[PDB]
Amino acid sequence: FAYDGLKRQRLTEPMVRNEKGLLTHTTWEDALSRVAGMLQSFQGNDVAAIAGGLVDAEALIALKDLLNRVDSDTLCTEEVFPTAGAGTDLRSNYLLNTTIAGVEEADVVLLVGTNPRFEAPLFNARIRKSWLHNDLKVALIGSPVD
Amino acid sequence: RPTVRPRNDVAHKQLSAFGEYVAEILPKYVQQVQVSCFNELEICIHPDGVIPVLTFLRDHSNAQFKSLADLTAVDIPTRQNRFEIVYNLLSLRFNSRIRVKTYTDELTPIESSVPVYKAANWYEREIWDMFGVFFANHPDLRRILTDYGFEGHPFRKDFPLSGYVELRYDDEVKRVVAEPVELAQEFRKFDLNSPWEAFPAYRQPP
Amino acid sequence: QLITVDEKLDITTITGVPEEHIKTRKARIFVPARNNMQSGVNNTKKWKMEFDTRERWENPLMGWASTADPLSNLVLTFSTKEDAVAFAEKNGWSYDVEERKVPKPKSKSYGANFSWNKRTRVSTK
Amino acid sequence: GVRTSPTGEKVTHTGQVYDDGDYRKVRFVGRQKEVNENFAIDLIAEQPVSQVGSRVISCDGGGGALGHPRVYINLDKETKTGTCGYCGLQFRQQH
Amino acid sequence: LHHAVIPHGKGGRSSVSGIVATVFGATGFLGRYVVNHLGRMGSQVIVPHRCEPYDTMHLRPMGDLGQIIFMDWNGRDKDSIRRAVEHSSVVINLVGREWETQNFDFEDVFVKIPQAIAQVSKEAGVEKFIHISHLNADIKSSSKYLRSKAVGEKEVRETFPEATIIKPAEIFGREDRFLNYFANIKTVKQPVYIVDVTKGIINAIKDPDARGKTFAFVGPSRYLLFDLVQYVFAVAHRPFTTRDKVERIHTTDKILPHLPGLEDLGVEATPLELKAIEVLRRHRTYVQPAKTIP
Amino acid sequence: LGLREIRIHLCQRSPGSQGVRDFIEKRYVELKKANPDLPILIRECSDVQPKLWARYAFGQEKNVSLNNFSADQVTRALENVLSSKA
Amino acid sequence: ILPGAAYTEKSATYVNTEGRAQQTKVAVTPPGLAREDWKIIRALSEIAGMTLPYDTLDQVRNRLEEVSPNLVRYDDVEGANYFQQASELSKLVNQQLLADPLVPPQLTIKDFYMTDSISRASQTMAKCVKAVTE
Amino acid sequence: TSVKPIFSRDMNEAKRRVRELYRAWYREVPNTVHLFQLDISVKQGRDKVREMFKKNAHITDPRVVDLLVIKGKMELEETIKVWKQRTHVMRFFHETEAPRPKDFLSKFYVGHDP
Numbered sequence A: 001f002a003y004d005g006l007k008r009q010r011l012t013e014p015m016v017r018n019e020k021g022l023l024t025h026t027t028w029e030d031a032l033s034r035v036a037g038m039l040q041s042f043q044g045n046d047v048a049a050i051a052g053g054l055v056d057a058e059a060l061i062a063l064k065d066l067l068n069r070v071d072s073d074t075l076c077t078e079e080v081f082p083t084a085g086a087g088t089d090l091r092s093n094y095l096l097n098t099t100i101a102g103v104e105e106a107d108v109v110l111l112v113g114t115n116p117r118f119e120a121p122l123f124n125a126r127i128r129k130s131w132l133h134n135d136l137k138v139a140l141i142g143s144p145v146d
Numbered sequence B: 001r002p003t004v005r006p007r008n009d010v011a012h013k014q015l016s017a018f019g020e021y022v023a024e025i026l027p028k029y030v031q032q033v034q035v036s037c038f039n040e041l042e043i044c045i046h047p048d049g050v051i052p053v054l055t056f057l058r059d060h061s062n063a064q065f066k067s068l069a070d071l072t073a074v075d076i077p078t079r080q081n082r083f084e085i086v087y088n089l090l091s092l093r094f095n096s097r098i099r100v101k102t103y104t105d106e107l108t109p110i111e112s113s114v115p116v117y118k119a120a121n122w123y124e125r126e127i128w129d130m131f132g133v134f135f136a137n138h139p140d141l142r143r144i145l146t147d148y149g150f151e152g153h154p155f156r157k158d159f160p161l162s163g164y165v166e167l168r169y170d171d172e173v174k175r176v177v178a179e180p181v182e183l184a185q186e187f188r189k190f191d192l193n194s195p196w197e198a199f200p201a202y203r204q205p206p
Numbered sequence C: 001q002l003i004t005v006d007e008k009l010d011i012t013t014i015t016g017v018p019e020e021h022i023k024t025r026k027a028r029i030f031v032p033a034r035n036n037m038q039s040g041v042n043n044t045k046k047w048k049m050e051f052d053t054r055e056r057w058e059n060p061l062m063g064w065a066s067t068a069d070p071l072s073n074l075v076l077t078f079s080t081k082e083d084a085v086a087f088a089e090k091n092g093w094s095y096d097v098e099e100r101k102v103p104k105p106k107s108k109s110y111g112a113n114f115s116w117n118k119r120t121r122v123s124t125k
Numbered sequence D: 001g002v003r004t005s006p007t008g009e010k011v012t013h014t015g016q017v018y019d020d021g022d023y024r025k026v027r028f029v030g031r032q033k034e035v036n037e038n039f040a041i042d043l044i045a046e047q048p049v050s051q052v053g054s055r056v057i058s059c060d061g062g063g064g065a066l067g068h069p070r071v072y073i074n075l076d077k078e079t080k081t082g083t084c085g086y087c088g089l090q091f092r093q094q095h
Numbered sequence E: 001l002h003h004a005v006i007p008h009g010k011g012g013r014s015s016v017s018g019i020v021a022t023v024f025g026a027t028g029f030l031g032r033y034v035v036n037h038l039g040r041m042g043s044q045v046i047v048p049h050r051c052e053p054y055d056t057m058h059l060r061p062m063g064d065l066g067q068i069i070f071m072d073w074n075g076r077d078k079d080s081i082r083r084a085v086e087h088s089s090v091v092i093n094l095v096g097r098e099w100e101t102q103n104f105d106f107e108d109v110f111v112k113i114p115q116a117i118a119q120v121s122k123e124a125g126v127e128k129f130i131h132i133s134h135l136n137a138d139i140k141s142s143s144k145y146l147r148s149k150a151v152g153e154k155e156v157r158e159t160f161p162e163a164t165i166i167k168p169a170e171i172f173g174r175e176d177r178f179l180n181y182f183a184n185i186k187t188v189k190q191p192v193y194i195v196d197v198t199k200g201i202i203n204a205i206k207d208p209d210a211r212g213k214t215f216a217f218v219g220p221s222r223y224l225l226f227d228l229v230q231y232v233f234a235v236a237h238r239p240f241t242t243r244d245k246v247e248r249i250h251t252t253d254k255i256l257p258h259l260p261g262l263e264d265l266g267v268e269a270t271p272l273e274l275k276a277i278e279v280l281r282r283h284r285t286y287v288q289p290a291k292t293i294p
Numbered sequence F: 001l002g003l004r005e006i007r008i009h010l011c012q013r014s015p016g017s018q019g020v021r022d023f024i025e026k027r028y029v030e031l032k033k034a035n036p037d038l039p040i041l042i043r044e045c046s047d048v049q050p051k052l053w054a055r056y057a058f059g060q061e062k063n064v065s066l067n068n069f070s071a072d073q074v075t076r077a078l079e080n081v082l083s084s085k086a
Numbered sequence G: 001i002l003p004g005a006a007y008t009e010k011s012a013t014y015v016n017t018e019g020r021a022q023q024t025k026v027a028v029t030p031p032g033l034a035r036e037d038w039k040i041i042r043a044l045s046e047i048a049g050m051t052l053p054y055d056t057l058d059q060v061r062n063r064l065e066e067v068s069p070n071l072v073r074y075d076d077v078e079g080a081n082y083f084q085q086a087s088e089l090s091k092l093v094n095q096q097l098l099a100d101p102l103v104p105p106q107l108t109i110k111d112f113y114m115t116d117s118i119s120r121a122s123q124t125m126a127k128c129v130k131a132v133t134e
Numbered sequence H: 001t002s003v004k005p006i007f008s009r010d011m012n013e014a015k016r017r018v019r020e021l022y023r024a025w026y027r028e029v030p031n032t033v034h035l036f037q038l039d040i041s042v043k044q045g046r047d048k049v050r051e052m053f054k055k056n057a058h059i060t061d062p063r064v065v066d067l068l069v070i071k072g073k074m075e076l077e078e079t080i081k082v083w084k085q086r087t088h089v090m091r092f093f094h095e096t097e098a099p100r101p102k103d104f105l106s107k108f109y110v111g112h113d114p
């Protein structure tokens, strides 16, 4: 039901700040030249990027390539993941390694610091399915949510 | 039963017997013979047998299919040989009809049947125009229905309904010009098929 | 008499399609997903080929949806993915194939609704 | 219920009207914007509620086969009327 | 951009170019090419016309349904000008007459009318204004047509300072009064092709750098008037008016290097040798190129 | 100008990646101990030829095939990449 | 501000919590002057004189395979290994737990409906929030 | 992989038919320009003929080449016999089409298509 948010508050035109200090519509050529000029005058730590929650991988790599070409490596995400130890070196460090379907094969599930009902609602549905049909034992560490 | 079409077993039996008759006489070319539930006899042949099979049906004393009612093609893209070539023949002597079918692809030519029936001349030109099937030894093969210089074969299943170009008069060049097609209202595709099976008798093995 | 042709079957030059609608298009070869609104499965039997969606805009006069994509409505049907792929290749279309999704066999038991000691016991009928 | 916008253009029953900066209203210059003045929403709101003595009432829209498909309307709720889904006529149970 | 003038489509007949253009003087020679190019790409064209609607019929096929809109106007009535331009993003002035009439002299058609359109357009908030002047416009010319052009070019520049002013040499084409003028019969000429002039106008609408500039549209080559007229007869196989018209024909085409030309707008000037046959074929009764001044 | 990132690609089953798998199982922990701030992105994907990618300053990248290498040939290949500053 | 596309307006790759790569398809094109997100960056890199080496969606997907091959294996769950090595490096540097109890950001249904720009813009989600909180 | 031919058994005989077709088209251009009173040159017409032939230079299948020659001969018959009109001949040149952008940036500014 959130698809109707795609019809409101949409960005439809490039914008830049004018002399009054307000965003105003401009062309693609004007907007990108403004950005391209600034990108050519900075290097290294002077340039950084943050990726939001709904960004696709094609845009993620394109942006990483562009900032690398100014010798920048500050490609960041909003969500945190500890970089201690292996960090993002090994994929198994940050994946649901059992897989969603593997929940139906488990016999004990321990939940730590998550309300999966509202974080991964279909994943929680899978847990209840095993709870119901496999007599799965579920334990939780965290707030006692429904 | 007032609303159901009545069957005709006498005609079904007669056509089945004649279908075997043809298969026995031309085993070199006949691949399949079937009679539909509404009594139409279909002879499916290898495309090499077009001229021999048609000549036999026209000229044999027990056939005498002197009239080519129609000749057309069907495009079925899922087949290796996408084009089905259909001949519908009429025998006045025996007051009967028969259908001869064969097949070809985009690159394999079919022998022109103008020697058997002069009616085939324009029918084969239309097939070439609409489906792009080439007929060998045709007295004058060329487009017949499409505009001169028209590119593509419109009746192929993968040719778009509205085509690729549209015409208008341009005042700057003082003539009719062709340009890529843009439509003020796009044709609205409808998904009409019911997800529930209608005819169990035609169910295919899973 | 026959001849040997060892070439890959390519008919792009004799189909009359404009070049832009061969090189720049991405065909999708797939079995359609069951419409979740209904239980019938008869629309999930055949393989379908469709092309990438392109721009539709509002007609200034009426507001109708206009297009310049000639293949916007072209959907082809195939008995197998192999037939679909063969058709795509000879026509020069780059394509993506999606494997057929089949519902897995389920274990159903009306009696489990009344289990003596299992959570499958239903609380209502 | 034809209301007019600040620029003088009539608002249709579907709520349509070109805004101030919309070039498309040039089409009406020297001509007119066709608007139907009989707003069906205002006209159906004038009909009175029909008082009936049953929990269920039917509406075919009037005129028999000249109306709409015949539907049956439940009147159990006493905090609102039963409205025909086809023609908008309203019903209420007596007492 | 207002949402209705954001371009959509592939630049064809049913596309939306985002241009809403009022073209004054659209029913003449240059007008039909300008309206054609605007309608080719799906622009909203407003055509104010003084003439019978019958004389506007050739413009109707030039645009998809609804895109060509016709209005009555009078050059002396500012209310009619305002009606035509107040919804537009660009106003194009192509009004003119090669001769004077009892109701409209050159001062009315090349000074008063252009000034009225420029002022009303300015008041109505129109952002772009394209005014056609003349290459040989000169306050001290011997031709009153060219004297009025220079006065009007000045009035438009002060009234609409952001206006784009375009100064074409004599334009040749199927419906011109240049090659046809000779065919129906000291000085150097640099004639320019009709379609090049149109392409220049269209590119000026889309070019933001064109605002406030003055352009001169000239052909690739310069010819001696005698040699040019000789060439026209050879092409037509023809064996080799007003006094004011003769003055302009005998005015040498000015060289103005300080103004941008067709090249600055992306238009490649078309030689007269490639297009004379197209214009002059109708004059044959069923060729060595002219010497070019370098 | 020097190194910015290392990426190692390999299969989970294929014998051609056996040397790479051994290297990771036995040498990666020590390698990461000596280079705590160097990203060593290990990315397994079935039926790929093992490869080593080194990304240098200003987006310069090189790749060296590790197919059929041994745990030592892998060790040298990392050693060459760490020593070189392309 | 550079207007990009939404997930309904591009064919783009997303990796789910299992590490499974999946791609969207274009249902409608982006509104107004908005453009595909990777194309905005590719265009910017050309104007800045540092042109990226991909010109098509397939090419920028060949780039993705060069960085992490599993990003182009659509619908496949590529197993990840070496949990033992990650655990060893985890034990290297101890850190302290804070006494604060683990509390999820979403405690009741009202926190569920609005969590990103699209849902925050949704009038339907606003009705759902109003319904459960009142 | 054994197929029935159209006219040519191999590329060598297919290429012979291609050259004969090109000679016929090359020699026909001067008549076409005059007969249809076209406003292009003979050089322009012969350049177009080369352009049309060259775009198919990559075909290695004698059956595809045979069909291309068949269609090219059909197109020539229409021109020689004046079944085409001026509009049909002049369609090869697209003189009312604005040149579509080619580079990435130009295509990026105008819309979403590749």
Ligand SMILES: NC(=O)C1=CN([C@@H]2O[C@H](COP(=O)(O)OP(=O)(O)OC[C@H]3O[C@@H](n4cnc5c(N)ncnc54)[C@H](OP(=O)(O)O)[C@@H]3O)[C@@H](O)[C@H]2O)C=CC1
Residues within 6 Å of the ligand: E024, E025, E026, E027, E028, E029, E030, E031, E049, E050, E051, E074, E075, E093, E094, E095, E096, E097, E098, E104, E109, E132, E133, E134, E135, E167, E168, E169, E170, E171, E178
């Ligand atoms: N063509 C050339 O050789 C050159 C032309 N120019 C300028 O280009 C513009 C057009 O050229 P061209 O198209 O050849 O001129 P045309 O005479 O061919 O077209 C004249 C236009 O002006 C309109 N017009 C004339 N007088 C009036 C008036 N009193 N009130 C309202 N409308 C009027 C006409 O409308 P109607 O049809 O109703 O009379 C017509 O639409 C003119 O400004 C001309 O001076 C400049 C340099 C060279």
Ligand SMILES: [Zn+2]
Residues within 6 Å of the ligand: D059, D060, D061, D062, D068, D084, D085, D086, D087, D088, D089
């Ligand atoms: Zn009713």
